[PDB]
Symmetry: D2
Subunit: 185 residues, 4 copies
C-alpha cells in the first residue's frame, strides 16, 4: 500500500542519522579508528513480505534498517559495542554474540538490535535497527555465503557447505593470529 | 582547545542530516538548495572575543540555509520549532527590519545536544537562513570589506544598499509569481 | 536493447566532464568563478518527446547537459576562453543568449562541444551542451520550467509578462552587482 | 620554488584516474570486481624522505598512487586486461608480486603507467603506480606499515616471521575462497 512510503522513509532517516554517529564514533579516535567502511541497507518491502510470508501482514521485524560495522580487529568489535552502551539516544534491546558461539555455518558476527528515536517535524518516532559488527574476513565470508545461496536457491551440497566451514575456521584463526600481532605493539 | 572545537564540528555534522531530512519531507518541492557549514577558527574566536574577557559566543558553529523563496525561509523556522532535539535561544529576523547596510537574513541561535561517548554536551549554533540573492549580496559585501579592510567609501556602500534594495524587490516579485501556481 | 549501451557513453562523458571542471576550478581556487556544476543525463521519456518531432538518431545535442553557474557575467566568458584552450574538446556550436535574449527573457550562454571518452572497447565522440549562467539566470530558468510544468504550457500573458519583468531586473542586478566588484 | 605547479598535476591525474576506475566499474554494473578505490597523492614531505637515496629537487613513480582492492585473485588480472585495452594510458612497468612474492610475504600486482592529463595550458604525461590487491592483501600491508612505524624500522625476527605466517594463510584463504566461487 502507500501507507508504506511514509513508514519505510522514517527508517531511511534513522540510517542517515546513524552514519554521523558512527562517523563521530571514529572521530573520537580519528588515537586510531577501527571502523573502515559502513554499509546500511533498508529492506525492499517485498523481502519484508516474503519474510512476513512466514507470519501475517506488524512492526516487529528488526532488520528493516540494517547497518554493518566492519572493524579491523576482533578487540575493536567489543570496543564499539561497549561504547554504544554509553550513548543515550539509543538503547540496546538485544545482543547476540555469534563470536565464540558461532552458527554451524561458521558464521560469526555481533548483532545488536536497538531502539532509535527519530526527530521529525510533527513529533518523534522510535524505530528499531539491527547492527551487525564484523571484522574484515567476517563480512567477506558472509557476503560470499549469501551470493552462493542466491544463485543455487538454498540447495547447496554438503562439500560446498563444508568448504565454507573450513573458510570460517581460518578467517577467525586469521583474525585471531592477526590480533596477537597487534598485541605485541 | 583541540578537543572542544571538535564537539562543535560534530554538532554541524549532525545538523546536515536534519536539514537533509527536512527537505526529504517535501521530496512537493524542497526549498533548501545548498547548505554551507563553517566552524570558526581559533584565531577568529579570540579577536571577536577581544571585546570582552577570555563559550558565550554563539556563531562558533554557523550554518547557512539558502532557500528558494522568502516564504520558504519561515517554513524552515516553523519546522525547526516543532523539533525537540534543539531549542531556539534567540531569533533575529533581519528581513522586514534590515540593517542600514541593506543586509537581510534570519539568524537564530539554538542549543544542540551532542551525544558523545562519555556523556552529552549542549552546544550553541547560529543558523543563518537566506534566499539566493541574500547570500550573494552578503558574500559580495564581505569580500569588499575584506579587500578594503573596513575602509569602504560612501559611494560604494550606497550601491551595495541600492543593490540590496533591488534584490529584495526581486525576491519579492519572484515569490508572487510562484503564488499564481 | 542497444539504447542501454549508447546512453551509458553519454553518462560516462559527464563523469569525464565533471573532473575537467573540477580541474578547471582547481586552477583558479586566484579566484574561481564556478560555484555549482550540475550534470543531468537526459531522461529516456524526455528524449522521445523531443524526438517526436523527428523519427525514433543522435542529432539531439543536450543528451548530456552541464550547468555552469558562475558568479558574474565577466566570469562566464572566462570559462569560455578556458574551454577554448582545451584540446580534448572542440566547440561545435555557440548560442550567446546573453545580450541577444529570447522574448521570454531567457539568458544563458550555451555552447555544444564534442568530447572524446576513452573506454575499454575504443573511444567514442559524443556531444554535450554546456549552459553557463549566473546565479539569477539559473533561478529564473528553473522557476519558469516549474511554472510551465504545472500549468501545462497554458500560461496567461500576465504571468509571462511578470517573468519578463523579473528577468530584465535580475540582469540589471547582475550588471549593477558586476560594476560594484570593478571598483575593487 | 614552484614545486606547487608540478606536484599539483599529480593531484589532477588522480581526479582523472578516479573517473576511469569509476567508469570501468560502470561497464560491469555483469558484475563488478572493483570494490573501493583510494587515491593518495604523496605528501610533500614523503617525497623528500623517499628521495634520500638520490639527490633532492621526477623519477619517483608513486607520487600519484591508486589502490584497486578486488574481491578475488581472478578479478585482479581482469582489471589488468581492461587497463591494457585503454589507449589513454600505457603500462611502462609491471611487477606481479603475486606468484613472485617478497621474502616478507608482501603480495600485490603493481604496474606503473603513463597518463596524459589535459590541462588548460597543455597536456602533461605523468607516471602513476597502481597497486591492485585483494581484501586480505590491503589489510596485511596496512598492518605491516603500522608496525614498522611504531617500532621505527626495528622489528624483531618473530614478528616478521609471524607476519609471513599470517600472510601465507591469507593468500591460501584467497585461493580457497576463489575456488568456492568457481563451483557456482
Amino acid at each position: 500500500m502507500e501507507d508504506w512510503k511514509n513508514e519505510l522513509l522514517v527508517y531511511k532517516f534513522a540510517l542517515d542519522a546513524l552514519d554521523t554517529k558512527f562517523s563521530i564514533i571514529s572521530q573520537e579516535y580519528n588515537g586510531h579508528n577501527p571502523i573502515e567502511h559502513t554499509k546500511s541497507r533498508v529492506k525492499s518491502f517485498e523481502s519484508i513480505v516474503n519474510k512476513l510470508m512466514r507470519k501475517g501482514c506488524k512492526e516487529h521485524i528488526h532488520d528493516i534498517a540494517g547497518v554493518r560495522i566492519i572493524c579491523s580487529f576482533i578487540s575493536d568489535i567489543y570496543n564499539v559495542v561497549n561504547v554504544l552502551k554509553q550513548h543515550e539516544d539509543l538503547r540496546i534491546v538485544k545482543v547476540k554474540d555469534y563470536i565464540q558461539t558461532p552458527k554451524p555455518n561458521g558464521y560469526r558476527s555481533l548483532h545488536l538490535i536497538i531502539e532509535m528515536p527519530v526527530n521529525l517535524t510533527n513529533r518523534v518516532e522510535y524505530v528499531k535497527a539491527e547492527i551487525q559488527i564484523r571484522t574484515i574476513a567476517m563480512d567477506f565470508w558472509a557476503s560470499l555465503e549469501h551470493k552462493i545461496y542466491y544463485k543455487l536457491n538454498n540447495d547447496v551440497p554438503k562439500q560446498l557447505t563444508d568448504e565454507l566451514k573450513e573458510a570460517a575456521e581460518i578467517a577467525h584463526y586469521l583474525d585471531e593470529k592477526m590480533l596477537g600481532i597487534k598485541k605485541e605493539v
